[PDB]
Amino acid sequence: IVGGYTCGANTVPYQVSLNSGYHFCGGSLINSQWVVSAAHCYKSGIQVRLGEDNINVVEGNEQFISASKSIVHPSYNSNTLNNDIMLIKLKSAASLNSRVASISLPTSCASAGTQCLISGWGNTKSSGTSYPDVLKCLKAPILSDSSCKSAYPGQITSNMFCAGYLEGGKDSCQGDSGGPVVCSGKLQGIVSWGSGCAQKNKPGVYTKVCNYVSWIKQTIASN
Numbered sequence: 741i742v743g744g745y746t747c748g749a750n751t752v753p754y755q756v757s758l759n760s761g762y763h764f765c766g767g768s769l770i771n772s773q774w775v776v777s778a779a780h781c782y783k784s785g786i787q788v789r790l791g792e793d794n795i796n797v798v799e800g801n802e803q804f805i806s807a808s809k810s811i812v813h814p815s816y817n818s819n820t821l822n823n824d825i826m827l828i829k830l831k832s833a834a835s836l837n838s839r840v841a842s843i844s845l846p847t848s849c850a851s852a853g854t855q856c857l858i859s860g861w862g863n864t865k866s867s868g869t870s871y872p873d874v875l876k877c878l879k880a881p882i883l884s885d886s887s888c889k890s891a892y893p894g895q896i897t898s899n900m901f902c903a904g905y906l907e908g909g910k911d912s913c914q915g916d917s918g919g920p921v922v923c924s925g926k927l928q929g930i931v932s933w934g935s936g937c938a939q940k941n942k943p944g945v946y947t948k949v950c951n952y953v954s955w956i957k958q959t960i961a962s963n
């Protein structure tokens with residue numbers, strides 16, 4: 741997260757870290773056994789870390805649970821990042837508490853101008869790299885369809901939206917991938933892609949979760 745703020749320990753209790761001997765992506769807890777992340781985060785050997793604040797120190801409240809299933813959308817395209825969504829099943833159910841909590845799926849899509857919360861342990865620099873120990877947060881609005889497509893002509897599908905700030909300085913970034921964009925208590929986006937981080941005229945691009953609610957439900961019920 742570039743230009744954000746320290747969230748505060750466990751203030752984003754649905755935020756998970758995906759770990760393979762290091763943090764490599766975020767995710768969102770949607771029930772005690774399932775996490776939503778990005779398809780481009782797929783790999784073997786995923787450990788889900790719930791209840792985290794400082795990802796480099798055991799502080800208490802962590803739960804570490806291996807992934808037992810990682811389900812990339814069948815129509816994911818790694819070149820266009822269309823359908824950039826993955827479901828992870830946990831080997832055992834998480835224990836839900838004030839610090840480890842699910843986020844609701846949308847019942848309808850969000851509109852332009854809606855303010856959302858974006859969070860993660862990704863890079864905090866727009867030039868160069870710096871990775872934080874504790875979770876970072878950013879408030880950011882959804883942009884209009886016309887401004888999104890203006891920004892990235894011929895690259896925005898109906899399964900994407902743009903959010904953030906065209907003036908530069910405030911964005912998600914590498915390592916935030918797969919993490920949440922939450923609007924009015926609903927998981928509306930997944931951190932997916934962008935041109936650089938926090939660059940002028942190049943906002944963040946997010947997977948449009950409302951288009952996937954039926955697929956998510958249908959996939960969880962059959963697995």
Ligand SMILES: N=C(N)c1ccc(CNC(=O)[C@@H]2CCCN2C(=O)CNC2CCCCCCC2)cc1
Pocket residue numbers: 780819820821895911912913914915916917931932933934935936937938943944945
């Ligand atoms: N909000 C941001 N600025 C931002 C940018 C990047 C990321 C992490 N995502 C990435 O690095 C992803 C993974 C594979 C290549 N990615 C890219 O972001 C690479 N760039 C292209 C841009 C235009 C073509 C359409 C399809 C997307 C890729 C996360 C957030």
Ligand SMILES: [Ca+2]
Pocket residue numbers: 792793794795796797798799800802
């Ligand atoms: Ca920790």
